[PDB]
Amino acid sequence: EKHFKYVILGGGVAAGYAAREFAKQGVKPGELAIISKEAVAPYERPALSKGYLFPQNAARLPGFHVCVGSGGERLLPEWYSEKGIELILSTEIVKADLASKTLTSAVGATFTYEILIIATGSSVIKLSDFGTQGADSNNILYLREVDDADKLVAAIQAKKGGKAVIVGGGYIGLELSAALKINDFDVTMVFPAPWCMPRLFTADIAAFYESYYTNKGVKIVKGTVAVGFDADANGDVTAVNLKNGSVLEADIVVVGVGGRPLTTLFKGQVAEEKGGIKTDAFFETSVPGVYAVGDVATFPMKMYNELRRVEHVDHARKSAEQAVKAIKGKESGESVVEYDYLPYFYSRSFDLGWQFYGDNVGDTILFGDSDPTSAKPKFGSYWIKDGKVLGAFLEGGSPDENKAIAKVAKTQPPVEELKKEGLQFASKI
Ligand SMILES: Cc1cc2nc3c(=O)[nH]c(=O)nc-3n(C[C@H](O)[C@H](O)[C@H](O)COP(=O)(O)OP(=O)(O)OC[C@H]3O[C@@H](n4cnc5c(N)ncnc54)[C@H](O)[C@@H]3O)c2cc1C
Ligand SMILES: NC(=O)C1=CN([C@@H]2O[C@H](COP(=O)(O)OP(=O)(O)OC[C@H]3O[C@@H](n4cnc5c(N)ncnc54)[C@H](OP(=O)(O)O)[C@@H]3O)[C@@H](O)[C@H]2O)C=CC1
C-alpha cells in the first residue's frame, strides 16, 4: 500500500496541467502521484480528433503530451521521474474511500493521500449503453482516449477508400466527418437535431457549415437516428439502419453522441449538482482536502453567477492550475483569487477554424463574409441580452481579431446597427 501527500486521480488534461503547476509551486520528490488507467503520461486530448488522424505527418505521442497544446513545455514521462512525481499508469481505481483517504485499484492495490484531486474527465456514450441492436459489431468506433484513436487509425487503413457513417452532430461529428473525408472515405453524417452543433450554432452559422461540408462531398442525413446495424459473418458492420426505415452502407461507423462526467466512484460521498461534483471557487468539494477539476466539476461561474459544468480543454487546464494554487495557498496560508472563467470554445476541420467567447444567450446578429465558397471565409456573430453583448463567435479570425471578440465577451459593451461593420465593433472596443 502506497502513501502520497498529493494524489491526482486521472492521467488526462487536468492531471497534467495540475502536475506542471505543482512543480511551479515547489512540489518535492516523493510527494505527488498521478494514477491513470491509461498507459501513457497526460496528453492534449484535442489532438486525437484532429492531427492524430492526418494521413501524413500525423500527431503521435510523445509529441502531444501536455503542455504543448497551450504553448507550454512538453512533460515527457522523464520529466515526471526527474521531479520525483510518480506516474502510476495502467492502473484503474475501482474503489475510492474518502473517509479513509484510500483508493483501491482493479488488481487489489491500495493508495493513500492527504490531498486528492479528482480529474477523471468524461465517459464516451456508446450505442451499446442503449442496448441498440448490433451495436457490438466490429468497426463501430468511439473516440475518447489514445487507445481509441489507434483503433480508428487502424480501421482507416484497413477500410481504405470505403464508406464511413458518422453518427452525431456535435463536436465529434463535425471533426470526425471532416477527418474521414480527408482520409478519402465516402462520408455520411447522421443526426436528429435540426442542424449541426444545435447547441452553440445559430441557424445562420449552422447553414454555413452544412453548406461547406456538402461542398466537400460529405452527405448529411438529418431528423433521424441509428436504430440498428447489420453485420457480416465476421461480426464486422456492413450497414446502419435508421429510424425512418432507410439504410446506409458502412465499412466504418464513428459515433459521437456525448460524454458524461465520470463521477460514480464518489456517488454519495460528495455533493453533486447539474450532473457533476459540486465545488467552490477553488475546486474544493464537500470533503475537505478533496478537489475536482475538468469536465467533472460543477463550479461557480462568477461572470454569470450560476453554477456550471464545462466540458472543454481550456477550462480543464485552468481549473487544474486553480486547484493546485488553492491547495498550496492553504499550506502557506496566504490567499487565492476565486476562479473567474471566461468560456472559450473552439473547433477546426478542413481549412476552417472558429472561436467563441462568453455566453450564448439573447438575440443574435450575424456579420461578415458567410460565403462557403469564399477563399478564406471570415464571419461572426454576436449574442445580445439586456442591451449588452454577452457572446461572440468568429470563423476565420486573425489573432488580433480573436483577441478583440474575447474582449467584447469579457467587457460586455452596450450596443444597434451593430450588424454594421460587425467585426470593426470588436476591433475598436
Ligand atoms: C477526442 C476529443 C477531442 C477534443 N477536442 C477538444 C477541442 O478541440 N477543444 C476543446 O475545448 N475541447 C476538446 N475536447 C474536450 C477536452 O479534451 C476535455 O474537456 C478535457 O480532456 C477534460 O480534461 P480532464 O482532465 O477533465 O479529462 P480527461 O483528459 O478525459 O482525463 C481523464 C483521465 O482520468 C482517467 N480515469 C478516469 N477514471 C479513472 C479511474 N477510475 N482510474 C484511473 N484513471 C481514470 C482517464 O483515463 C484519463 O487519463 C476534446 C475531447 C475529446 C475526447
Ligand atoms: N470542443 C471541441 O472542439 C471538441 C470537444 N469534444 C468533447 O468531447 C466530448 C464528446 O463529444 P461529442 O460526442 O461530440 O458530444 P456533444 O455533447 O458535443 O455532442 C453530441 C451530440 O449528439 C447528440 N445525440 C444524442 N444522442 C444522439 C443519438 N442517439 N444519435 C445521434 N446524435 C445524438 C447530442 O444531443 P443531446 O445534447 O441533445 O444529447 C449532441 O447534439 C464532449 O464533452 C465534447 O465537448 C470532442 C471533440 C472536439
Residue numbers in the entry: 4 to 418, 422 to 435
Paper text:
MDHAR reduces the monodehydroascorbate (MDHA) radical to AsA at the expense of an NAD(P)H molecule, with NADH being the preferred donor.
ITC experiments clearly showed an increase in the affinity of OsMDHAR toward NADP on removing the carboxylate group of Glu196. Although there is no difference between WT and E196A in NAD binding affinity, E196A showed a 16-fold increase in affinity for NADP compared to the WT.
